[PDB]
Amino acid sequence: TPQNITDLCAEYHNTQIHTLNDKIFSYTESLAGKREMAIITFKNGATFQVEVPGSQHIDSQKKAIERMKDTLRIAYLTEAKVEKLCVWNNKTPHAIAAISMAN
Amino acid sequence: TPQNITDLCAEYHNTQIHTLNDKIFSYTESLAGKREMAIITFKNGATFQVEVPGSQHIDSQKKAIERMKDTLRIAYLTEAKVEKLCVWNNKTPHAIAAISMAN
Amino acid sequence: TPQNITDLCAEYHNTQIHTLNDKIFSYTESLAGKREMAIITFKNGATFQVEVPGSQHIDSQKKAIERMKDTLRIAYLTEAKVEKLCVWNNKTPHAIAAISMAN
Amino acid sequence: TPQNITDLCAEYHNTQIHTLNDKIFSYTESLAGKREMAIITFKNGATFQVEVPGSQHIDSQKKAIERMKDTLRIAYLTEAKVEKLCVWNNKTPHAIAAISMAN
Amino acid sequence: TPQNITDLCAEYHNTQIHTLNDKIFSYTESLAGKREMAIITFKNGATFQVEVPGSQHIDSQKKAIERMKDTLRIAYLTEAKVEKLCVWNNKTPHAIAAISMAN
Numbered sequence: 001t002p003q004n005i006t007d008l009c010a011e012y013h014n015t016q017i018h019t020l021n022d023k024i025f026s027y028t029e030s031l032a033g034k035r036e037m038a039i040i041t042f043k044n045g046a047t048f049q050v051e052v053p054g055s056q057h058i059d060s061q062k063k064a065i066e067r068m069k070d071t072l073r074i075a076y077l078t079e080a081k082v083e084k085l086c087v088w089n090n091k092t093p094h095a096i097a098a099i100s101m102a103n
Numbered sequence: 104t105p106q107n108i109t110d111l112c113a114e115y116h117n118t119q120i121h122t123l124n125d126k127i128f129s130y131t132e133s134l135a136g137k138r139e140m141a142i143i144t145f146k147n148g149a150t151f152q153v154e155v156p157g158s159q160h161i162d163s164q165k166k167a168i169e170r171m172k173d174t175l176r177i178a179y180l181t182e183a184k185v186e187k188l189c190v191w192n193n194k195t196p197h198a199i200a201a202i203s204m205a206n
Numbered sequence: 207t208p209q210n211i212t213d214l215c216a217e218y219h220n221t222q223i224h225t226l227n228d229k230i231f232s233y234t235e236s237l238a239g240k241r242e243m244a245i246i247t248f249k250n251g252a253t254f255q256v257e258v259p260g261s262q263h264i265d266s267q268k269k270a271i272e273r274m275k276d277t278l279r280i281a282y283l284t285e286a287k288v289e290k291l292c293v294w295n296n297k298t299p300h301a302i303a304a305i306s307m308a309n
Numbered sequence: 310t311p312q313n314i315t316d317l318c319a320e321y322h323n324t325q326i327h328t329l330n331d332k333i334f335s336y337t338e339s340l341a342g343k344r345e346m347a348i349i350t351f352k353n354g355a356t357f358q359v360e361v362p363g364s365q366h367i368d369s370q371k372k373a374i375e376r377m378k379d380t381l382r383i384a385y386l387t388e389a390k391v392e393k394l395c396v397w398n399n400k401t402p403h404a405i406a407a408i409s410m411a412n
Numbered sequence: 413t414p415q416n417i418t419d420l421c422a423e424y425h426n427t428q429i430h431t432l433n434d435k436i437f438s439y440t441e442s443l444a445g446k447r448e449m450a451i452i453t454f455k456n457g458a459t460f461q462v463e464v465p466g467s468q469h470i471d472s473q474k475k476a477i478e479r480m481k482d483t484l485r486i487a488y489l490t491e492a493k494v495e496k497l498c499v500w501n502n503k504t505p506h507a508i509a510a511i512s513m514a515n
């Protein structure tokens with residue numbers, strides 16, 4: 001139904017679009033208990049995270065959270081340019097809701 | 104049974120074949136609740152989606168849906184040329200049913 | 207226990223070996239209900255399928271069918287030469303049972 | 310929520326941080342019973358393990374331990390520079406808790 | 413726990429270390445009923461299998477077995493030099509227990 005990341009982002013509160021058009025600068029992954037997350041940063045310093053699964057996530061999001069960590073890792077290793085990120089800004093670091101990669 | 108994507112596509116109602124013979128221009132992935140989907144684009148603007156798993160899907164296609172999102176991601180990252188897409192035209196963006204990639 | 211694809215193939219009824227020594231020309235995959243399959247072709251026109259999972263499959267072949275589809279996808283994308291395929295000939299297109307890849 | 314590996318590492322006892330800034334030298338993986346683990350080494354001889362999933366692990370970490378081995382395998386194969394490692398030092402070899410890649 | 417492949421291999425009966433320092437020559441994969449395994453060979457004729465899961469395997473070894481097949485496949489496709497293999501010499505072909513890669 002939404003046709004791009006901007007329309008999709010617009011369907012949630014506390015979200016904002018970050019136009020990066022750049023490759024991920026660093027990738028951090030954690031298996032530590034209560035911190036099973038991934039954190040990424042860009043050259044400008046901007047930091048984002050894929051949240052630890054919790055009660056704020058419905059069951060359908062379970063699979064998508066894992067896929068997102070897979071995507072980030074591979075985008076990072078292949079140095080793919082990420083166009084935009086839709087993030088929840090009520091979390092720190094900002095939490096990734098969706099990504100767009102282009103060209 | 105079907106020997107190719109065209110024959111396969113012809114076995115369903117509301118489907119059509121698109122011949123792109125081009126690489127995916129952009130890939131968008133979302134983990135947002137109720138919008139756990141992927142959307143792809145080609146240079147001419149043509150937009151397609153891998154639908155959110157819902158009641159129209161039988162048990163057997165859930166793994167297939169997951170595999171498709173995986174296929175679109177590497178196809179994108181590797182700039183693989185997609186030959187054809189069999190898509191359901193009763194959805195917007197058009198929903199991907201099958202894909203064919205050729206040398 | 208088999209030592210190679212040919213001996214493994216010889217243990218089955220209705221099987222046959224095809225020597226290709228060529229890379230995959232086309233990769234096709236479908237998430238369409240009741241047609242969750244993948245189809246590959248070679249320049250010589252040879253067409254093979256990875257069957258839809260079903261009755262003719264034991265619980266151990268399940269993960270293996272999924273694994274074969276991943277193999278065929280990555281082989282296609284990396285342009286790996288397929289040496290031989292052990293195929294069941296009581297199906298059309300011929301269903302894939304095993305694959306060998308040699309440098 | 311931590312913004313980097315240094316701060317995330319600091320949220321645990323018996324946890325040390327290691328700045329490597331080199332690609333992994335060796336990758337060892339085992340399927341032997343009771344020894345389903347991975348071991349990595351750096352050219353400076355530093356050796357680290359990804360623990361056999363045991364009782365000291367909560368359920369949320371299970372999927373995470375699998376992801377970490379996938380990450381170690383791909384970072385090794387692509388020769389990615391790993392920046393830092395947060396490791397629990399009450400283990401021998403020291404056990405990987407988190408990893409950061411910044412090339 | 414062991415700090416390397418030789419020590420690890422020494423913790424089991426009927427095992428031996430083979431130093432290859434060469435890439436995999438051929439990869440064979442089968443989905444055939446009761447023969448869901450992978451066989452790899454090196455140019456020197458060395459042939460090794462990843463056993464079909466059976467009664468000899470404990471529960472914790474089941475994902476390790478699937479992972480090892482992913483590893484062999486990716487190592488093969490990327491021409492990653494395999495250093496050593498720990499194998500059970502009471503099976504034919506000898507069964508892979510652990511693998512070390514160092515390029």
Ligand SMILES: CC(=O)N[C@H]1[C@H](O[C@@H]2[C@H](O[C@]3(C(=O)O)C[C@H](O)[C@@H](NC(C)=O)[C@H]([C@H](O)[C@H](O)CO)O3)[C@@H](O)[C@H](O[C@H]3[C@H](O)[C@@H](O)[C@H](O)O[C@@H]3CO)O[C@@H]2CO)O[C@H](CO)[C@H](O)[C@@H]1O[C@@H]1O[C@H](CO)[C@H](O)[C@H](O)[C@H]1O
Binds near residue numbers: 012013
């Ligand atoms: C803003 C918020 O607190 N969201 C939490 C969510 O709350 C639900 C309603 O929010 C939306 C949203 O997230 O913006 C509304 C959207 O239009 C929905 N969009 C679509 C396409 O469906 C989404 C979506 O359904 C869910 O996210 C699916 O999981 O939900 C929120 O407005 C509502 O609260 C109202 C209340 O109803 C109203 O009477 C009162 O006056 O004001 C409140 C705020 O406007 O309640 C809804 C739940 O009852 O609920 C989910 C759990 O489903 C989460 O808790 C969500 O929080 C975010 O979750 C993110 C990950 O999914 C991430 O962690 C964010 O940081 C969390 O805040």
Ligand SMILES: CC(=O)N[C@H]1[C@H](O[C@@H]2[C@H](O[C@]3(C(=O)O)C[C@H](O)[C@@H](NC(C)=O)[C@H]([C@H](O)[C@H](O)CO)O3)[C@@H](O)[C@H](O[C@H]3[C@H](O)[C@@H](O)[C@H](O)O[C@@H]3CO)O[C@@H]2CO)O[C@H](CO)[C@H](O)[C@@H]1O[C@@H]1O[C@H](CO)[C@H](O)[C@H](O)[C@H]1O
Binds near residue numbers: 117154159191193
């Ligand atoms: C067209 C439609 O509404 N399809 C929904 C489907 O409906 C079934 C019958 O449709 C087909 C079809 O999709 O074309 C008929 C094909 O020959 C079948 N092909 C094969 C290889 O089996 C497929 C297939 O069985 C299913 O897709 C597998 O899940 O189904 C449909 O024709 C039938 O309804 C008839 C009705 O019986 C008849 O009396 C009346 O005169 O005409 C109706 C319409 O032509 O009903 C069948 C279901 O009872 O059913 C599935 C669920 O099983 C879906 O709901 C499907 O909708 C599409 O699903 C897609 C994703 O899978 C996607 O979301 C599309 O946008 C949906 O429209």
Ligand SMILES: CC(=O)N[C@H]1[C@H](O[C@@H]2[C@H](O[C@]3(C(=O)O)C[C@H](O)[C@@H](NC(C)=O)[C@H]([C@H](O)[C@H](O)CO)O3)[C@@H](O)[C@H](O[C@H]3[C@H](O)[C@@H](O)[C@H](O)O[C@@H]3CO)O[C@@H]2CO)O[C@H](CO)[C@H](O)[C@@H]1O[C@@H]1O[C@H](CO)[C@H](O)[C@H](O)[C@H]1O
Binds near residue numbers: 426470502
């Ligand atoms: C040698 C053998 O038959 N091993 C089978 C194994 O047997 C167990 C004990 O064997 C070891 C081993 O595999 O070598 C001993 C190692 O030191 C252990 N190492 C570690 C780090 O724990 C391993 C390990 O625990 C298991 O492999 C985990 O599954 O096991 C063996 O010593 C023992 O012998 C007893 C006997 O049971 C008892 O009745 C008699 O009175 O005294 C003996 C004392 O000397 O029995 C253990 C089983 O209860 O068992 C596993 C299943 O647990 C396998 O069957 C294993 O066979 C090999 O398995 C490989 C795949 O896992 C491969 O397929 C080989 O081909 C199989 O031979």
